[PDB]
Write a protein that binds this ligand. Sequence first.
Ligand code: NDP
Ligand code: SF4
Ligand code: SF4
Ligand code: SF4
Lengths: 340, 156, 44, 144, 176, 112, 318
Amino acid sequence: HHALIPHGKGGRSSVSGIVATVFGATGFLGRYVVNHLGRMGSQVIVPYRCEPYDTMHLRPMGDLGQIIFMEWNGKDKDSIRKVVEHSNVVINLVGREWETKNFDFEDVFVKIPHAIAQVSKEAGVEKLIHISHLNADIKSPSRYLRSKAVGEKEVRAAFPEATIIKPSDIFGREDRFLNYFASMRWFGGVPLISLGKETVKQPVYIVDVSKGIINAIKDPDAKGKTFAFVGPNRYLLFDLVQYIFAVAYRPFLPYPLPHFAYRWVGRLFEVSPFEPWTTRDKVERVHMSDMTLPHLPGLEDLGIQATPLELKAIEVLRRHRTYRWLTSEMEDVKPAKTVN
Amino acid sequence: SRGEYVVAKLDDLVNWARRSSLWPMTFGLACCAVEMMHMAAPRYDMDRFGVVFRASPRQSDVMIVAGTLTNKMAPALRKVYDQMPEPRYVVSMGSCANGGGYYHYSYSVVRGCDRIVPVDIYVPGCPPTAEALLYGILQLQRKIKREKRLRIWYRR
Amino acid sequence: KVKQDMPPPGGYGPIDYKRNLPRRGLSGYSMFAVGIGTLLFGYW
Amino acid sequence: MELVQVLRRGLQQVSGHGGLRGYLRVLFRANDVRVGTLVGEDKYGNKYYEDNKQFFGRHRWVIYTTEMNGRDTFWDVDGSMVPPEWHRWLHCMTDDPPTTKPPTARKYIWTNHKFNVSGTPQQYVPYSTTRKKIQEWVPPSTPY
Amino acid sequence: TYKFVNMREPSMDMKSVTDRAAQTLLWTELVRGLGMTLSYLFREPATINYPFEKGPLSPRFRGEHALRRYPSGEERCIACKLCEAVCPAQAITIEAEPRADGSRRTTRYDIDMTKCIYCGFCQEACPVDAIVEGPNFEFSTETHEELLYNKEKLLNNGDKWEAEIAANIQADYLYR
Amino acid sequence: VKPIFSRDMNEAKRRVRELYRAWYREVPNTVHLFQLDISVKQGRDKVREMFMKNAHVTDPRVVDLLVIKGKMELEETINVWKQRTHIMRFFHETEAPRPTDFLSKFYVGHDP
Amino acid sequence: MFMINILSLIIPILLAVAFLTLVERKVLGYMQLRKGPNVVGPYGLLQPIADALKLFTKEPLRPATSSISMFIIAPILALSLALTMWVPLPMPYPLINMNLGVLFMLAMSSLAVYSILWSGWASNSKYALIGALRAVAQTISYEVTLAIILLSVLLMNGSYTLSTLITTQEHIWMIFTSWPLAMMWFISTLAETNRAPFDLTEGESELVSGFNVEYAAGPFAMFFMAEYANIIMMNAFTAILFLGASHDPHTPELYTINFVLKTLALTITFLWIRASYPRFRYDQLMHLLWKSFLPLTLALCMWHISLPIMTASIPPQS
Ligand SMILES: NC(=O)C1=CN([C@@H]2O[C@H](COP(=O)(O)OP(=O)(O)OC[C@H]3O[C@@H](n4cnc5c(N)ncnc54)[C@H](OP(=O)(O)O)[C@@H]3O)[C@@H](O)[C@H]2O)C=CC1
Ligand code: SF4
Ligand code: SF4
Ligand code: SF4
């Protein structure tokens, strides 16, 4: 019913034919998803639960009228119905790495997505894109990934023809993955469980993830398929953190820490009323090695070649450099050892 | 809840401080700047309202894009906006800044400052009268008065 | 009858257009004398 | 002395605004404690005053109503609250107040003036006012 | 025909020398400037108490565009499009079709208040007095789209401000 | 015809080679100063691509004027007159790829 | 209870600085046919508080090229030194009574200059560096003449103890004795506080903000507070040195009232000068001080050394 013929040359003023409701667009992934949608000419409906000031950065992303901001509440289904009523596509990117008093992991990764999928199915939205960590599993130590797996099951139940994208740690300028490791310099040495030798991670660039989502929206075959988004190279946590500190040109002092001590430290930082620096779930997820899932299709299926971490690391980590190393070129630091 | 009341009152205090002390940066591109100076002039003195022009972007809170923004000047405007500490608010004054105005179809004009930087209040006119700019500034102050940062923090 | 905005019959009054910076103050000798007298009384 | 007269005028200002409470109310709401002739008051509640002795630009002023169109305006007041009929008097486009010279009565003219509604659910939203130009073929409903 | 600024020679008599020496040592001219600033301190300030006090404006003021009607209630516009033609910034988009009555009316009348230069044209150009820049100047908006006016918005503005617009046109119609 | 700087194609080729040398040596300094995230090889490849775009020119005056424009651009880059936005505009990062095959153009739009 | 006294000196001085900002804004506006801030609070009284809250709730930015340690240390030094200099002042009784309070104030003023230089250097911005160098030139211009004028005037006091100035000026103001030195001292205080017409370090018109161009939110507020507190403290020093006040030991309130009024008048004169005159070129400032003030100060210092001897008016040492 809500079908628009695409018109134009794909610019800001063109009509892509894509009407989308990007839940959780006021976040690291939402910014790039909205920018990619707007550049094509698509109409983007942004539900925002925060102050309008925080959504201001997304205002220039689209041409006049393309970006519509409507306040929504995750608990209230009627707001979801209002936001998703006229959209031919819905993207759910609502996720908090730290639990909060009002909303726990269950609500953010299970209840919210299920309500979104059900209301979208009722409204008639053609396509739905849902994001769940690649490491998501019902038996995982981290509550975050456990709720992620339960939410994936529920979303598939409510919306049978729903594309579920399972991305790894997404490194970017606003990332909480590279910045998280770089910020550990302030605390002196870098605490690593087992020194990071036992953990292997496959980070993915944020722009690649957003382009994959957009291509999945464009791709007809993507319906009812689960894609795994992973970077070109797999790294040991020790090597990856060492490369982060090298590109940041900050001294690296890795010191092994027992898992229980790290969990206690995570509990200490959870106390913060504001956004926690780290959580026990954060420690568990960092330590957990990235799963390899050959069965699922990846970025190559959607037509995007994953950008290596080496190319884009300087963008994220230059700010952490001091004045001496601010102007150092990207090539000065050799690529880290890859466990492939 | 008592916590909600405390958060609401603290948010009231912060918003009152921010709206009462609004320091625009000394940024004027084109003819609209002259009406801005007339706003600073005695008749509509903006200092009464707490609006004081401060040159340094880091010591300013509001950027008023008065005048046409050429493609040459846009990177400098974005740089000045970025270097401005937050909370930061942008007011677009004049048709040229709002949507390009008289020079909309020029090769050297950005068809609106919204393309480069987020805009909070658009003041229409070419040039907007100093009273119109003062009205826009007071509207921005009311918009700040309506902000609910701490309430949202408590509810989140 | 024609009614345009016209100068009053006989014209407007003359408008001053030249510098009128006034001549004010005591002579230099007097100012120096006053300063020196104050200095002397203070010294005493 | 003239100083005593000025102080007595300040006390007269205190009395003319209805007492200390009214004096403080006006001082906080409008920041001006002058007392002037009340030319009139609009239906919305805005009161308009005139003091010809004061210099041009301050001879006429308006005390905005505390409640208009279902909005509490005790602290939040705006220029748009001024109804059109009193707008010309306030802005000195005319020397005759609306009470003395009423505006012409037309049916289409609004009876309730609305202030600037940007940032509110009543905000104007642009849309095209023209119907679809090209009509597509409707496929037949029979199989063949 | 020409006058010499500067081009004056100071007197060298002992009295004038002493006066200039006193000016240098005793800072007379700076004191004169200080006195001027003090006199301004004691003069009445010129600030007007906006919003409560509004600055003077004339009937020929050019503000928010408005679409007027006849006293009957029929819209004055006759879809001439000459007002569109004379727009210096091409801020007016007009489309017209014969209406059910058969009259020449505008199906679409849009003025982009973001491309407009508020020149005052199309008030002079429009033959039937339909489009008028009214007295309102305080129509600031929080979004760019709010400033892209529509025929409905312009007609609502005309209905809102017709009482003032008619009086101003009456005041200035003879000058035009 | 009056020569702009060169009376024959060989002289213009010599000037072009001199300009290419200047850009080739300037590229690393540009990456350092503008804090660009591209590698030196990437920038020098872009320089070669810009030179190759006009490799079809066969008229000495056109080549001389192109060398003049390139020298002006090099002066801009050697100074900081051009910002990082201007330097990175040569790399059309924001612009999406445009298919050149007939079928893709047919699918996407009416453009020839 | 000495801690109570220290807080009593500190906290009220900062509030005085805050309201001085309002006074300046209103005085300049009225001297410019304007009304200073009046909307925020009755007659603008609450504007300072709003400014302080806005600044301290605003994001502070640490420049990427900045040296963080000095960048942070400089505002702390400026504010702490500004508060410290108030301690020795007799109002009428000093918080800390020092035999050499005047030299202490001179040394502390010398130390405060490094706050500007350290801030400008750490900022690692060209405008900040230019402002720091201007501050260096300003100190070079003014320090020697300031010291010589203070020595010449204090020769009549007989000591560097600030308290004894009250006794020396019991019968007459010292401005009558040393009005030329008083004029040069007032201009030198203007120079030391970096106030117009010698507002070179900040120099908004010529340097976007001078040394504080890279400072935002709390650190800039601290620099502003230090500046205004130094203005008030220097004017109070002038009032003590030249415009002496009557002190009845049984009722100090009278002396305190007289002193506060004189200092307020001098600060108002500071704002008046900022409004009236244009700004000097730092080359011109240095030339004024070295070529014009310094020789006259040397001659007057010789005169003030000789005068107590030739008039048998040598002051008591104790
Ligand atoms: N590396 C990655 O980024 C990975 C991505 N994902 C998932 O994709 C998304 C990526 O987001 P990310 O980049 O981490 O940025 P954010 O953490 O900022 O994403 C959360 C977004 O949803 C909103 N939101 C958060 N909590 C709630 C809530 N309780 N109710 C309603 N809205 C809420 C936030 O707005 P507000 O601030 O106003 O609440 C924000 O727009 C998440 O859903 C994440 O779980 C999956 C695996 C890995
Ligand atoms: S909008 Fe009008 S007044 Fe303002 S800069 Fe452009 S042309 Fe000049
Ligand atoms: S006067 Fe106005 S409404 Fe009438 S035809 Fe011309 S543009 Fe249209
Ligand atoms: S007044 Fe407005 S509508 Fe009329 S010509 Fe000028 S810009 Fe166009």
